[PDB]
Amino acid sequence: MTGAVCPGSFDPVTLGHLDVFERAAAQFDEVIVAVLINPNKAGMFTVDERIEMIRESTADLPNLRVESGQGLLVDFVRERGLNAIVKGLRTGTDFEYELQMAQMNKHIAGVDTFFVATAPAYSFVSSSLAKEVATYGGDVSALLPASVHQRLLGKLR
Amino acid sequence: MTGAVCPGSFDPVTLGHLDVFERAAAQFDEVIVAVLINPNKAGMFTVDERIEMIRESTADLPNLRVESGQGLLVDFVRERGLNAIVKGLRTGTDFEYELQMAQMNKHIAGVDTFFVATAPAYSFVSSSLAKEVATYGGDVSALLPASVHQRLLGKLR
Amino acid sequence: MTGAVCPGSFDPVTLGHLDVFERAAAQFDEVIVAVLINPAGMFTVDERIEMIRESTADLPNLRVESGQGLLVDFVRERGLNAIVKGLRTGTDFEYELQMAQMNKHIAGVDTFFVATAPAYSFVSSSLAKEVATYGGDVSALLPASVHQRLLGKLR
Amino acid sequence: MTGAVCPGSFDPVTLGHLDVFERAAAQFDEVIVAVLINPNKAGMFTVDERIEMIRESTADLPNLRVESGQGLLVDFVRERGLNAIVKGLRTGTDFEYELQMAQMNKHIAGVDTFFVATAPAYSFVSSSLAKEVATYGGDVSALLPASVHQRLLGKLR
Amino acid sequence: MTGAVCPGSFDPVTLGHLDVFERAAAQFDEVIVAVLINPAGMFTVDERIEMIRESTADLPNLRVESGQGLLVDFVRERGLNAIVKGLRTGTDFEYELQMAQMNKHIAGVDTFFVATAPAYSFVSSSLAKEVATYGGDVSALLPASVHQRLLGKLR
Amino acid sequence: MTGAVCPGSFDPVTLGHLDVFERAAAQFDEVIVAVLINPNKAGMFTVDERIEMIRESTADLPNLRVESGQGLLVDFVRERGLNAIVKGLRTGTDFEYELQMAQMNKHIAGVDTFFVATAPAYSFVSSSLAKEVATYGGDVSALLPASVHQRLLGKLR
Ligand SMILES: N#Cc1c(N)cccc1-c1cn(CCC(=O)O)c2ccccc12
Ligand SMILES: N#Cc1c(N)cccc1-c1cn(CCC(=O)O)c2ccccc12
Ligand SMILES: N#Cc1c(N)cccc1-c1cn(CCC(=O)O)c2ccccc12
Ligand SMILES: N#Cc1c(N)cccc1-c1cn(CCC(=O)O)c2ccccc12
Ligand SMILES: N#Cc1c(N)cccc1-c1cn(CCC(=O)O)c2ccccc12
Ligand SMILES: N#Cc1c(N)cccc1-c1cn(CCC(=O)O)c2ccccc12
């Protein structure tokens, strides 16, 4: 039984995220996408909206499921019988930040972290920049799943 | 079912390598350590020596095996019915270099790459620096497995 | 007719910015400095524009405008499709590469970068204001005009 | 004669900080740990608490003392007749940021800065990440000196 | 009359290089690609020049020359004082920043950088030759012309 | 008795190096510049020529001396009763490389390493790029001490 948790805000999920989901699900028996609820910074979409968008985008991934996440990530992972985190990286600076989190998580709970490199096409894509561009009328449709873009237009009106 | 190839020169294997082997073996059903040889440049250790040093320090990992090869890594991977590479990284610069290799490998063969962050204790450990230090009589005993240190001193004398 | 937009907050413009303006102006027929209305800084947009105008008088082919909304819209609505910006660090490059690739994707607008002059490697609007606030001498890092205005803003 | 100031928020002091204090004290005749306070943003610990935690874990360093301050660091340094700052770095990004600060400080006041590389064991340790992990109940006991860990748990409760 | 020199070994030219050539040509009146005679590669300087010429036919304001000696001399002896180059990584930026600052110091020649297209982030002449040598398909990373020539060089 | 060894090829010494020498000598009781002899890569200047150029450039630094260095650096340091290395850094990548060497040197011998950031004016200066530029007729006179530039012109004819 191999498996990993894929944590993030996914506010909203982008094609960069989806590519990582697919690639994780291709190699692990089970993937759990954890949608992290931050009571301090409530973004654009509610946690349930985010989960709904990820489920529509990952309909063809039967070994991937989506749940809301709260509290300490390594607790979330271990309570579900798993011992691994998986995440995508775009830049060296991403790696620096995530290496520090990864080493902390392994230190405090023995949970390991696996990274994959971004697909070239999505190296500049992020939820925050996509939202910003869309807010000022820019076309981010090629960067988001179809379901997401429609929902995004709805929020902006 | 799940499986990954862990590639390198391993000339010689270090504790940093072994940590990554152990962590990969804990997460994939099988791991193949691929000792990749350039047939036109010998290292310090012969291929048989490299493999023996790895085997002697991985005896407790039942789902790990060690094989040598040359040429395209993605051919080594695919001929074994696998589709994943696993590698450790120490720095953001390592990430930039390995990201380019991973994106090339996925492009030409559809093979994916998973990275793990170095254990903190081994952030400064490399085969090349260990050999250089040992060449001038520095004590690298704590950085190498027992199967390696004295063999190394033997080469140097 | 070649041209480029040089975007930033410029709060206030420093000698580092000015060096980039001069270097852009030397290579493009037309340069527009876009002062980004980002509505919480020290100077008003109009104050920033004036300070830039004062220190770029020797550059005949440069003008200064306030900017709001999508930068790529600002650029294209003025008939251009190049952005020019200075970089100090590889980290700056990473951040700016993402914006550059986004801007090219959504609008076909390209971005050209120049490396900082060695002398201005440590100069930023934020650090200059911070040091000046606690009484440090930043006169050698700002246009003579800007330096007087900064003193006034603090008193 | 020789002396340096080691500046920071130390909110709270970690083992990574203490390692740098010890290493600085071994190389300069005197070291002053400067607890720098922003009078408009409180941290987790009061200045007196911060200083007490540092003192309790530096009792074996006879040439180290601890003082608080605010405003320009170079004024703190020069008013004590010193001309050097000493700081630890974990990453190349830390270096880029601290290089800009060091060059500014030498420009405005002629004060120089000396950097040391983190101990490998503490590469992932920061006050902020330790507080964040502890807030959600993660075990950070091995990352903080005895003078700190339980005081921290006390704040969080 | 604006212009820039785009220097490199181009052994061989890739789609990553070509993208930069096209983007430079769109913003400067004149672009000169300088093929650096570095006298040990795969193609001769003349072969490299021809391959570049073949794939830049649609760019009226671009020409290709061999280059030797100081780049800043090459640039200034042709009446220009700008270099243009592409970057993939922050590490590229660090390396190139040092050359750029050196070149500005010794000769007053400026350097403009552009960010790689996302699609070509992993593309280099060296990696393309290496993969092709061991039998990998790099046809999507090279100009159609160049790709045929590379196959020939290996057989 | 504070002190440090400043190691390098110094082939030839540049104003970037000299700035670091001056700043080290301003803070340590004793500085020893170690001119590293590499039997594999013999550069432009002999070790004795390099030592001579450094001595002329550091004539006003009475607590700095210059010696040839061979073999393991931490042995060189410790045999002279010192326990510290000092070096200058220009970029984050410099820091990455040197952090690894620094951690190795502290691991194998307990010798510490202190870094300073380059002066802004010399951030692009290196011996190798200076030699290359000068070789093809470029003016590197503002980047080198006077004595060095004269000697450099001599070698190029
Ligand atoms: N966007 C994006 C992206 C991309 N374009 C390419 C590669 C990875 C990602 C990625 C970013 N994050 C963090 C953002 C968040 O937490 O919502 C992830 C979290 C988990 C898995 C993947 C990602
Ligand atoms: N040494 C080291 C090391 C470390 N200390 C920490 C983290 C990863 C590694 C590591 C380096 N390589 C390069 C190949 C080679 O060295 O021969 C790997 C290949 C596979 C798995 C791990 C590593
Ligand atoms: N300060 C500084 C600086 C420097 N010292 C050297 C090189 C470039 C710059 C630079 C920074 N920014 C962003 C800050 C802002 O948005 O105002 C620029 C925006 C446009 C052009 C140049 C810069
Ligand atoms: N934590 C940590 C740490 C570490 N684990 C390793 C290396 C240096 C440090 C370190 C961070 N800071 C920032 C200031 C602060 O945190 O309050 C310093 C200030 C002075 C000396 C050392 C450090
Ligand atoms: N390959 C590649 C590439 C890419 N895929 C994306 C962006 C830039 C480049 C690029 C690399 N170099 C240096 C290699 C050489 O000297 O031949 C350039 C020189 C000039 C212009 C562009 C490049
Ligand atoms: N050149 C240069 C330089 C600069 N411009 C600014 C800051 C530091 C240096 C510097 C480089 N190295 C390594 C090169 C060598 O070993 O010869 C040093 C070794 C010791 C002390 C300083 C340096």
- Which chains have 3+ CB pairs within 8 A of C? A, D, E, F
Q: Identify whether F106 is a catalytic site residue.
A: no
Pick the CATH number of C1-155 from 3.40.50.12160, 3.60.70.12, 3.40.50.620, 3.10.580.10: 3.40.50.620
The answer to whether E75 and E82 have CB atoms below 8 angstroms apart is: yes
Residue from E10, E17, E114 whose mutation best tests the ligand 5 pocket (most atoms within 8 A of CB): E17
Q: Which residues, at least 6 apart from C126, have a Cβ–Cβ distance to it below 8 Å?
A: none
Structural domain boundaries in chain E: 1-155
* Alpha-carbon dihedral F21, F27, F30, F31, rounded to 10 degrees: -20
**φ, ψ at C29 (rounded to 5°):** -65, -30
* E138 interface with B at CB cutoff 8 Å: yes
Of F70, F66, F82, nearest in space to B137 by CA = F70
E strand or H helix that includes residue C148: helix C144-154
Q: Which residues of A fall within a CB distance of 8 Å from E91? A: 92
CA distance A77 to A85: 8
* C98 interface with F at CB cutoff 8 Å: no
In 10 A of CB D137, how many CB atoms? 12
Q: Which atom of ligand 6 is the closest one to the Cα of F10?
A: 17
CA distance C115 to C128: 20
CA distance B78 to B75: 5
Of E150, E101, E109, E104, nearest in space to E127 by CA = E150
Six token digits for residue A35: 């949608």
B3's torsion region: left (phi>0), alpha (psi -120 to 50) or beta? Answer: beta
Of E57, E34, E39, E45, nearest in space to E11 by CA = E45
Strand runs (DSSP E) across chain E, as ranges? 3-8, 30-36, 62-67, 82-87, 110-115
CA distance B140 to B13: 13
The answer to whether E40 and E20 have CB atoms below 8 angstroms apart is: no
Q: Side by side, which strands form the sheet with D84-89? A: D64-69, D30-36, D3-8, D84-89, D112-117, F112-117, F84-89, F3-8, F30-36, F64-69
E strand or H helix that includes residue B1: none
CA distance E106 to chain F (A): 6
Q: Which residues, at least 6 apart from B74, have a Cβ–Cβ distance to it below 8 Å?
A: B105, B108, B109, B111, E136
CA distance D62 to B9: 48
CA distance E49 to E27: 22
**φ, ψ at F90 (rounded to 5°):** -105, -40
Count each helix (H run) and each strand (E run) in chain C, helices first.
6, 5
In 10 A of CB D64, how many CB atoms? 20
Residue E94's Cβ-count burial label (10 Å; 0-12, 13-18, 19+) is buried
What residues does ligand 1 touch, defined as CB less than 6 Å away?
Answer: A 6, 8-10, 14, 16-17, 20, 87-88, 90, 118, 122, 125-127
Angle at E126 between CA E122 and CA E129, to 5 degrees: 100
Residue type at F97? Y
In 10 A of CB F143, how many CB atoms? 24
Note whether C70 contacts A138, CB cutoff 8 Å. Answer: yes
Tokens 């093809």, residue? F136
Instruction: Out of D23, D78, D80, D90, pick the active-site residue.
Output: D90
Tokens 């795969």, residue? E42
E strand or H helix that includes residue C90: helix C90-107
Angle at D17 between CA D16 and CA D18, to 5 degrees: 95
Q: Which residues, at least 6 apart from A117, have a Cβ–Cβ distance to it below 8 Å?
A: A88, A89, B95, B98, B99, B102, B103, B113, B115
- Specify the pairing of strand F3-8 against strand F30-36: parallel
Q: Give the resolution to one decimal, in Å.
A: 1.5
Closest in F96, F103, F104 to B91, CB measured:
F96
Residue type at F106? K
CA distance A139 to A142: 8
Note whether C101 contacts A124, CB cutoff 8 Å. Answer: yes
Q: Which residues, at least 6 apart from F119, have a Cβ–Cβ distance to it below 8 Å?
A: D103, D106, F16, F19
Whether residue E10 has its Cβ less than 6 Å from ligand 5: yes
Task: Classify domain A1-157 by CATH number.
Answer: 3.40.50.620
Q: Considering only CA atoms, which residue is closest to atom 15 of ligand 5? A: E8
Under DSSP, the state recorded for E69 is S
CA distance C117 to E33: 25
Tokens 């340094």, residue? D77
Radius of gyration of chain A (CA): 15
Torsion sign across C-alpha atoms B129, B130, B131, B137: positive
Q: Give alpha helix (H) positions in chain D.
A: 15-27, 47-56, 73-79, 92-109, 127-135, 146-156
CA distance D37 to D18: 19
User: Distance, CA E22 to ligand 5 centroid (Å)?
Assistant: 13
E strand or H helix that includes residue E152: helix E144-154
Residue A30, helix vs strand vs coil: strand
Residue type at C152? G
Cis-peptide, bond into residue A12, ω within 30° of zero? yes
Whether residue C20 has its Cβ less than 6 Å from ligand 3: yes
* Alpha-carbon dihedral E73, E74, E78, E84, rounded to 10 degrees: -110
Angle between helix E90-107 and helix F127-135 axes, rounded to 10 deg: 50
CA distance C44 to A131: 27
Q: Identify whether A107 is a catalytic site residue.
A: no
* C144 interface with D at CB cutoff 8 Å: no
Radius of gyration of chain B (CA): 15
Q: Identify whether F127 is a catalytic site residue.
A: yes
The answer to whether C111 and D82 have CB atoms below 8 angstroms apart is: no
The answer to whether B63 and B38 have CB atoms below 8 angstroms apart is: no
**φ, ψ at A89 (rounded to 5°):** -130, 135
Six token digits for residue E17: 């290089």
Angle at C107 between CA C103 and CA C108, to 5 degrees: 85
In 10 A of CB A139, how many CB atoms? 12
- Where chain E is discontinuous (C–N > 2.5 Å), the residues before each break are 39
The answer to whether F132 and F143 have CB atoms below 8 angstroms apart is: no
Residues β-bridged to residue F89:
F117
Six token digits for residue D85: 């700052």
CA distance B19 to A57: 36
Length of chain E: 155
* C100 interface with E at CB cutoff 8 Å: yes
